[PDB]
Amino acid sequence: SAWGPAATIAARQSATGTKTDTPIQKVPQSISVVTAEEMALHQPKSVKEALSYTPGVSVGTRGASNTYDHLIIRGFAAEGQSQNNYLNGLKLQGNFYNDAVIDPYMLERAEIMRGPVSVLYGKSSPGGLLNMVSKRPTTEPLKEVQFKAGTDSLFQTGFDFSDSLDDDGVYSYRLTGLARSANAQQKGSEEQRYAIAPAFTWRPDDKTNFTFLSYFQNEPETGYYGWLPKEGTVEPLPNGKRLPTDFNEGAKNNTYSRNEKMVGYSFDHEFNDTFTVRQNLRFAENKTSQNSVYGYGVCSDPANAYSKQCAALAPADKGHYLARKYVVDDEKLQNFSVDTQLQSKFATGDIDHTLLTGVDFMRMRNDINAWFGYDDSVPLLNLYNPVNTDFDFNAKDPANSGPYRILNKQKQTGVYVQDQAQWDKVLVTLGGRYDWADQESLNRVAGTTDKRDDKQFTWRGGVNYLFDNGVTPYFSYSESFEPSSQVGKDGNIFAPSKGKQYEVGVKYVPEDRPIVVTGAVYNLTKTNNLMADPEGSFFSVEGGEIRARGVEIEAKAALSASVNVVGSYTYTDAEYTTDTTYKGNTPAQVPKHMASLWADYTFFDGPLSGLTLGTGGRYTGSSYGDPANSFKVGSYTVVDALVRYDLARVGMAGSNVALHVNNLFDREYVASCFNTYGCFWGAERQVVATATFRF
Amino acid sequence: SHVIITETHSTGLRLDQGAGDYYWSEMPSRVTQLHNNDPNRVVLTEIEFSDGSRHMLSGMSMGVGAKAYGIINPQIMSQGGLKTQITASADLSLDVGYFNTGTSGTIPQKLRDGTGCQHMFGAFSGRRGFASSAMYLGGAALYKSAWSGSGYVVADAGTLTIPSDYVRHPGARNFGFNAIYVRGRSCNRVLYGMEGPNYTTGGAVQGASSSGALNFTYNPSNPESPKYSVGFARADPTNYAYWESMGDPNDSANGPIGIYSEHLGIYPSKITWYVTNLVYNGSGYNIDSWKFINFFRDVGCNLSKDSPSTGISGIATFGLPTTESNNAPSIKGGNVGGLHANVVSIYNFPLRLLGGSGSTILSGNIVFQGNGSVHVGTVGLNGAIVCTMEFIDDTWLSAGGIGCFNPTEMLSQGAEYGDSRFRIGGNTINKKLHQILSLPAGEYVPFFTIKGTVVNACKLQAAAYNPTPYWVSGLPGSVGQTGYYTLTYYMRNDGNNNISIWLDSSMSNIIGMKACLPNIKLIIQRLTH
Ligand SMILES: CCCCCCCCCCCC(=O)O[C@H](CCCCCCCCCCC)CC(=O)N[C@H]1[C@H](OC[C@H]2O[C@H](OP(=O)([O-])[O-])[C@H](NC(=O)C[C@H](O)CCCCCCCCCC)[C@@H](OC(=O)C[C@@H](O)CCCCCCCCCCC)[C@@H]2O)O[C@H](CO[C@]2(C(=O)O)C[C@@H](O[C@]3(C(=O)O)C[C@@H](O)[C@@H](O)[C@@H]([C@H](O)CO)O3)[C@@H](O)[C@@H]([C@H](O)CO)O2)[C@@H](OP(=O)([O-])[O-])[C@@H]1OC(=O)CCOC(=O)CCCCCCCC
């Protein structure tokens, strides 16, 4: 029952909402954290599946794809389906297809922060961010080796070694790594990942903690990142059947690689009881190279209206020939982030202030050598009898394809002041942040460059009344901004898409019972969103606004010494309040109702002492398949089981042999669709026999 | 049966009604009847200038103002646009055309319903999708190409098919043309605008006195469908004409704008129609105050270049083969050099139609990749001939490359040779151009020039959107790459009764084009005493 006092007690402390070590009851926003114990219990494939039982986040939008940790938090994502993940309070600043992904096995805590939190993290999506704290070295010698053998030829070998070099524990290290090799659900696609995170910690005393954090990951084959039509996944094919859940529409030589080399540290130093400084930095050199042929809806799709290959087909056969497109991408992203904070814990009479003043600098340079295959660039796939053929990518025909070579430079310096004034029980968390966000982009095909330097100020004022019994009602208005990467009819980059949120809720976090029940009702609006041109042009325009009012209830409660219920619920009324073509429509891949419930019973007495039979069922409501709301993806209820039995009874203390069955009922469900041409099948039933030995 | 001139009607050339440069005059009633109600009668038009220079109309001419762009962001959208402006004249280097005085407006405005009118063609397409190539949908919709590159096909039943009665052609005889305008410059290659009609607008042509406006706006309510539009309009040849809300803001990323017409320096003052007794039957000619044609009024007839290669690499204007008022051949204006002027001999008080007439149809789509001539046809029959350029198909305005065939086929890396027209429906218009031509043995006599000033527009000078380089090696800095070409058709006398047809192109900043031969039913009858 390691996760017992870890999901309800050790999960109470969080440093994402306020960038200072405060309990979640003292954070005036919806923040959910999952400790490494929950990560080990659920054994998620990515951080998304780790955040399955947290409200406000749609983690299964891409289905069986595990390429990126793309989360639609509160109905909002980043610019152009980008990632908004922070690792050690520092953003995994990825651009275009070059997005950083950290294995959940290689993290000690994933704190998802919901709502505008740009007051501390610079530019961010209005939905929120995800903070995945690394596995810092432990002073207690831990030598863990884990083997994950499961379906789809998943053979993951991992290890996690940490020990104190000297007797006093001044020098402690942690060399954690893994080597997974699995075939994707889609027939033909394989997913390989080789991640290593050597970490070194230096502790002169109990005041200073300089831990060097690195993370090197190599993915020779990321997996499947293609699109499928709504005509075959959601709607039946014209013959009445549906596309199989293991359908890969890519070429026989589809390639998708990623390589992350992150080197940094997390420096903590406490001068006195009233002045403690912190500093996190990390340089990440991410490289991705992909040769992907992705489907673009069947030939009857509006998008493939003429599409000569589609036109040459018989009118009755245009409804089941999948017109596809190819992309040949090669990147090298050099990200650098610095976040220096000075936490001044002082008092003014009765009030006790925690004045966090800091400077945050993030610099990302991302060159892109990509070639895009436009409409009618690859042969159509006959969904009735598909044939996988080696589509060569060097034959870059300029008639139906065009280069996309660009050097995306992004820089941001942020000075923020945050004051957590606590008087009696009225904790007033008032913050503000001035961001000097600069962005360049050099189109190397032509030679043009466009630059935009944004100076956006975002603030968050929250008031929490920490009642003695445990329920702490809170209300907070928090701002966010996220500069656009698009240019208008004038060739100038747009103003940042600012995000405002008025969130009211309670956090029942008693100091005696192990229950972390949390509620929240928010009115999150993303102003200055980019919409289609009112006139007859295909450019973008400012003035768009997406407003999402939602109610989120989270319940993490250890009912008994054995039972551990970790549930959630999310009602999300996202809507384009102001738009030209989608006014009144609900955004795609945003289900109105999301619910989840995880209950695990840990046997402790009797012949079965050690078992952890836990069954959890995540429900996702019906979501619109396109922004035009032409069709709705059906609602599905996936059930994940877990049969974990520790080997302490056998004799190997700490070692546990588990059996995780994701989607226990093998439900064939379409996870989500962002348009009629792009749909993602859900992951099928997957058993994973995990045996983590504390050798 | 000798070739004689039965009637000769002369007139001045007025400049009133706001003509400015279009020296115009109502044709005599007899000349109007013989030009409209009796098309098959070979009447020779002779222009007399203020310097005493005399020139006979011989051969067609053309001028295009094409402007194309292909901007695309692979994550956001894709946009295309093709605005051409075809202006044609009834003389090889002069701007000679016919118009109806009944049309309201100034003399250039009267040209909106006559020949020498900038037949503008527009195709604005696009889509907001991932890796969309809807930039090339305008080319598919506007141009009826079998296929040459890769992209979309738009069926004729869907897109706009301009009726052949809506496109005026110098030498169109089914129309009512009672006045003629002659300008000392060449055809107006009015270069303006980059996009067709704008959807979500009325589609009206704002900017010039347009006429015959045809639009096909494909604007489905589905936001994920490639929207496009096709527009055609006959507008003022001397004024910038554009569709509503689709003007040209003259950025560096869009090339220049202007009504280009290379002046020859001469100013017309008199027009004389020599009504010969040559009646054109369809496969030659038959013989039906009294002047005779010989090879003593010496009138400049045509040019005779030694080699088709003008060697100008750009707009290669041919000087007008005039004749001073002292019976001496000369050449006035022009950029090309080395031309020899040939003169007919008209006198009043006897060459005769030689038996056997050769006729050919200049059909095909010759793909060019640089300055260089090519043998595009042959005629199966001294070098004195009478020629009629009968256009059996309305593809004359599709003749000439870059913006006249499909400015999205240049992307393909192979010999296209695709039948890429302008989608002009039917041929219910009589298009005839009678002309007497002297063809010296071995020398090349031009009879059709397609001088064209084009710009490979870039719309946006932004790094987000990559402009498609159609007929250029690239678009550095996303600036519009202005191009020029002078596709010229030469008629040479081989000496073995074979009148070979040679087409010479003179590009500048253009990697190549496809020049659709304008289906000319070239009919030659050699005459010599
Ligand atoms: C002791 C306590 C810690 C104390 C820690 C203190 C650190 C503070 C550092 C802050 C400054 C910074 O951010 O430092 C970064 C990261 C370095 C690592 C940091 C430590 C990590 C980990 C820290 C330690 C953890 C414990 C440098 C970088 O990122 N460099 C990458 C570079 O791109 C960025 C460049 O532009 C930017 O400005 P821009 O122009 O873009 O605006 C930068 N200016 C800034 O930031 C200013 C900033 O805003 C001011 C604010 C500062 C805030 C500080 C506060 C905070 C202070 C905190 C206290 C500029 O930096 C500098 O100017 C130097 C200085 O700043 C760094 C020195 C100190 C750090 C190192 C010691 C390390 C420290 C000692 C550690 C032992 C830089 O040069 O591209 C190279 C490739 O170039 C080409 C190639 O040909 O392919 C050609 C190129 O073309 C061109 C061309 O464009 O260049 C043009 C052509 O015409 C032609 O001329 C052509 C020519 O032919 C070519 O010569 O060049 C182009 O085409 C690209 C293409 O784009 C491909 O993408 O490709 C890459 O090579 P690659 O990828 O091929 O290998 C390279 O990556 C590699 O070097 C990185 C290698 O990692 C490893 O070593 C890490 C080892 C760590 C130890 C390991 C663990 C130990 C146990």
Numbering used by the authors:
A (entry chain A): 20 to 714
B (entry chain B): 41 to 328, 355 to 361, 374 to 427, 456 to 487, 494 to 641
Publication passage describing the model:
We succeeded in solving the FhuA–pb5 structure via cryo-EM, using complex purified in decylmaltopyranoside at ∼3.1 Å resolution. The FhuA–Pb5 structure shows that pb5 is an elongated molecule with one end inserted into the extracellular lumen of the FhuA barrel and with its long axis approximately perpendicular to the OM plane. Pb5 inserts four loops (numbered L1 to L4 from the N terminus) into the extracellular lumen of FhuA. With the exception of EL1-EL3, all FhuA loops contact pb5, resulting in a large interface area of ∼2140 Å2 as analyzed via PISA. Pb5 completely fills the extracellular lumen of FhuA and occludes the ferrichrome binding site, explaining why addition of purified pb5 to E. coli inhibits growth under iron-starved conditions. Interestingly, pb5 binding does not cause conformational changes in the TonB box, and the structure of the plug in FhuA–pb5 is identical to that in apo FhuA, despite the fact that ferrichrome and pb5 both contact Phe115 and Tyr116 of the plug. The LPS molecule that is present in FhuA X-ray crystal structures is clearly visible in the cryo-EM map. Interestingly, the region at the other end of pb5 that most likely interacts with pb4 is poorly ordered but present in the cryo-EM density and only visible at low contours. Combined with data placing pb5 at the very tip of the central tail fiber, and the loss of tail tips when detergent-purified FhuA is incubated with T5 (13), we propose that the disorder observed in the pb4-interacting part of pb5 is caused by FhuA binding and leads to the dissociation of the tail tip. To our knowledge, our structural data for FhuA–pb5 provide the most direct evidence to date for the view that DNA transfer does not occur via the FhuA channel, as originally proposed based on single-channel electrophysiology.
Here, we visualize, for the model phage T5, how host recognition and SE can be achieved via the interaction of different phage proteins with the same receptor in the Escherichia coli outer membrane. The receptor for phage T5 was identified as the outer membrane (OM) TonB-dependent transporter (TBDT) FhuA almost 50 y ago. To elucidate the mechanism of SE via potential TBDT structure modulation, we report here the cryo-EM structure of the FhuA–pb5 complex and the X-ray crystal structure of the FhuA–Llp complex. Our structures show that the phage lipoprotein Llp exploits the known allostery in the plug of FhuA in the opposite direction as during ferrichrome import (i.e., from the periplasmic side to the extracellular side).
